[PDB]
């Protein structure tokens, strides 16, 4: 199989035009931000990563035509999954099994997570690394990644929105694009599309666990005041 080249669905070509290179997001967040892991700094880093995701959504086809109430509902249903997918893809590209790469460029040894993290977080980090391994084995590429981000953003049943038609059409176009692209570019991975949808089931499971970790921190009064992920958690 091989990525890109000819025969790429229009939706995917459009999404690639809206996806910043990792180096550019890094610079932006390091700019917005400025031993034991610095907890509040990492919380601010995750908030800034979500702000970057909201900026991407704002520019996307379809999403940019929706009224604010529909935009908020979509993001309220997808924020945690978009953050998990962003972290997972960053690891797939990084390609190191003994460390994790943060959006700031910081590298964190997994041995350090075993020393510093409690059980909820340690288990979550390791479960996420298993999905990273699966996606690397499946040869997840950038075309698939951006389509998966769009699919998640638009994952909500349209009955919860004012503009049913536009979002339903976006859902259908994104599923068709991922199916067409994977079949044409990875013909010998015959069930790649289904395998990516099963990977999204795992992103949702990881997201739920991440929400439970944030809720435990919130009840313990450990989160910074006015944290954006907690606002999303309570919405």
């Amino acid at each position: 199989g091989s990525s890109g080249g000819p025969n790429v669905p229009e939706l995917i070509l459009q999404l690639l035009q809206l996806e910043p290179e990792e180096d550019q997001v890094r610079a932006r967040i390091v700019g917005c931000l400025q031993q034991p892991a610095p907890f509040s700094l990492l919380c601010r880093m995750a908030d800034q990563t979500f702000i970057s995701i909201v900026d991407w959504a704002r520019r996307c086809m379809v999403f940019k035509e929706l009224e604010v109430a529909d935009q908020m509902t979509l993001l309220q249903n997808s924020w945690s999954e978009l953050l998990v997918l962003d972290h997972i893809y960053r690891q797939v590209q990084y390609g190191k099994e003994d460390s994790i790469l943060l959006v700031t460029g910081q590298e964190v040894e997994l041995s350090t997570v075993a020393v510093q993290a409690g059980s909820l977080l340690h288990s979550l980090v390791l479960r996420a690394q298993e999905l990273v391994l699966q996606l690397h084995a499946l040869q997840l590429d950038r075309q698939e990644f951006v389509c998966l981000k769009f699919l998640i953003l638009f994952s909500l049943d349209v009955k919860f929105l004012n503009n049913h038609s536009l979002v339903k059409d976006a859902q259908e176009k994104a599923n068709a694009a991922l199916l067409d692209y994977t079949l044409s570019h990875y013909p010998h991975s015959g069930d790649k599309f289904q395998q990516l949808l099963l990977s999204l089931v795992e992103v949702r499971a990881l997201s739920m666990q991440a929400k439970e970790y944030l809720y435990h921190k919130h009840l313990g009064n450990e989160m910074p005041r006015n944290n954006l992920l907690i606002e999303m958690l309570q919405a």
Binding site: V54, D55, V68, M72, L75, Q76, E231
Partner: peptide
Amino acid sequence: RPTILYALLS
């Protein structure tokens, strides 16, 4: 009710 999310989208 003003929220951070609404401020990001406006």
